[PDB]
Amino acid sequence: KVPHGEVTLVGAGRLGFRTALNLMQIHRGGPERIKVIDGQKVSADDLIFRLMGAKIGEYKVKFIESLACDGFSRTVQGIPEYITGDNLRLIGGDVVCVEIAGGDTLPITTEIIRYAQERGAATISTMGVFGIGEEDVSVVDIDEADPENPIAAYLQAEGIHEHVLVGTGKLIRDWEPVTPHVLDRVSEVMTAEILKLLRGA
Amino acid sequence: KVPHGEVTLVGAGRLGFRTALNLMQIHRGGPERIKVIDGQKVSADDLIFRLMGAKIGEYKVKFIESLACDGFSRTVQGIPEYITGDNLRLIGGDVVCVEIAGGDTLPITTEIIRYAQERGAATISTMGVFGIGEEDVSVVDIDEADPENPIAAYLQAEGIHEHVLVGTGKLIRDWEPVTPHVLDRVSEVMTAEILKLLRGA
């Protein structure tokens, strides 16, 4: 049982970086290729990166690529760009996981899931990653998801189907911030659901 | 002798596909990573690509990366974008080779060299690749290049130094078309010159 299969991670911030580390450490299986796409640099406030050795001002993705040194047997590719309506061709592979934050992310998330499912990729993304540590992380297909969750509401109005959602279901409006423990939990679950989708391919 | 270092080929058409194929069949050394960057899709006119099994409509770079299957012990990365003054970030690693054609290529060529050399990459590009078959292929540093050549002239005007040019010297003003043999011979010397730059690093 060797690696096979390509996972693209659009978004490699505090969450996506955890997802990348988890996928990169997989043995007896998991993906052969990991593509990570994010336009942002490591800042002072990115302690989880700096604690692992990233320098302030280094592209996120380039740090993550750097961990797959000469000899590493999976392929890790980082592309230091934001996904826009204009570079969807950066998206294919076998599974596409969207873990982006900042601004309004729903129209791009929708454009990413269409394009990828068009090309035959299974899709997964988050539905709220707020929490103080003591929240459950749940997983639901889009057509069972809570229609009061703004993320599910938006994706269901965009007529998205066969799309996995992970997270705590707490969002920016309500009071809880984002703690590292909640992100570790959501990352673990996300990794497990990516591997299920990878098997389905 | 083992694979080490990264080469970036900006442009992967008739000529840059040939230098890719060369670098990807190196053994007992050569680069560890080959990064191929080109915005263009394979067309019916691209026979070299078609005869090697590419489908019309495929990005040139996805094709190239596809040849590097599971098991391949160097890493090949295809980024299906044109370099512009906005995404120079894609430019990095140990050698960057510019083999682009099609419209306004001397500004973007200048910007790539300066941006690459500032991040410490060694740089190489073409100086005319027209010819009917046996014309000499010469190699020359920018500061030794003949200022009758419009490419040399442009780069010298822009104060480019420590920059290797390779080609036949024949340009649009010459009566010659571009033939597949002249490309093979320019690709072969390009490959040799990249390997020199890679060792010196």
Ligand SMILES: Nc1ncnc2c1ncn2[C@@H]1O[C@H](COP(=O)(O)OP(=O)(O)OP(=O)(O)O)[C@@H](O)[C@H]1O
């Ligand atoms: N269009 C997009 N394409 C690629 N990446 C994007 C896009 N929009 C945002 N991002 C990336 O998503 C990442 C969000 O990471 P960030 O650390 O800010 O939040 P997070 O991982 O959700 O964790 P937290 O829950 O702590 O905010 C950033 O690195 C950002 O660059």
Ligand SMILES: Nc1ncnc2c1ncn2[C@@H]1O[C@H](COP(=O)(O)OP(=O)(O)OP(=O)(O)O)[C@@H](O)[C@H]1O
């Ligand atoms: N700004 C750019 N960045 C990346 N690639 C580019 C850029 N501009 C042009 N190119 C690429 O340069 C390649 C040139 O390929 P093309 O087959 O047309 O000419 P060639 O390699 O010089 O061969 P010939 O000498 O027969 O014309 C194209 O695939 C094109 O997409």
